[PDB]
Amino acid sequence: HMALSLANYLAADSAAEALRRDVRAGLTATQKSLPPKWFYDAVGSDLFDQITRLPEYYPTRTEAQILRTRSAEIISAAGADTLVELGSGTSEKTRMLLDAMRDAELLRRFIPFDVDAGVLRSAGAAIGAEYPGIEIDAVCGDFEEHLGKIPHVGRRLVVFLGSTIGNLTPAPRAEFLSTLADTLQPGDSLLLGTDLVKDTGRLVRAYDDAAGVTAAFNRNVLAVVNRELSADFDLDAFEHVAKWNSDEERIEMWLRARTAQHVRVAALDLEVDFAAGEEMLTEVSCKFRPENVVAELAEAGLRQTHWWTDPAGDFGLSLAVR
Ligand SMILES: C[N+](C)(C)[C@@H](Cc1cnc[nH]1)C(=O)O
């Protein structure tokens, strides 16, 4: 099944330059950091897939169970014939929504939007084979820059699942939602997944699993830098640390140097020192309160028409309209 349309707004040389800029800025900052987008090379994407099946990492299965039991209601409320996914279309959650759109005799079109064109091609072929006659228009782009490149055809249900929105701190998060709302037409809908404030032990353990998989995922960002920028990070020298930040109500992932480290990043003509015990921030994952989700949507210009949550209150899905 080779039927496909694909627009690609991302260039290899542009991505390499973004990594250079990000690593230089993050490793020379007074408090070191690295952006989590760089976790998702081939290795890191596979580790994240594994994370979604860990006993401690409740978000994926919780969101999936909400969609499993409520997809027909979501689809009926949206009335859309086109599913736009800020994501690659590889998950069972995608099929739950497409199945419900098919069951309702609404489904015409799938628009996956993500950063890896090869994965979009694979997902497109799989979706095409499962939903014969569906139009697939894939977009390779950055969801903080190319949202205007998503086609406007049809009545669109735009979905952003998994609480990936929690990787944006409040100012960029507000800008993202405001921009997204300005690409929607009357009649379009946003389905947004948000992980919720809950027991703090359960939160920390979800990012510090017993098997060490999250720790490997986190340290792999050092392997990305090592490979792409000719650096010599010693991954064994960095401890994985997950923290609950109660002031910002967010999970944080950090890497902590066990002993002083001297790291050359040869491609940047840069050497960088870590003191013993020095920590570097690699990810934030903001957790939400239901009343604040409504307010953030409203501030972006969207009205929350529906809210779904599991019986434990662990996770929330919002449907919002212009
Ligand atoms: C895919 N998101 C960004 C939603 C995940 C990434 C992640 C999982 N374990 C550590 N980081 C999340 O924040 O829970």
Ligand SMILES: [Mg+2]
């Ligand atoms: Mg040099």
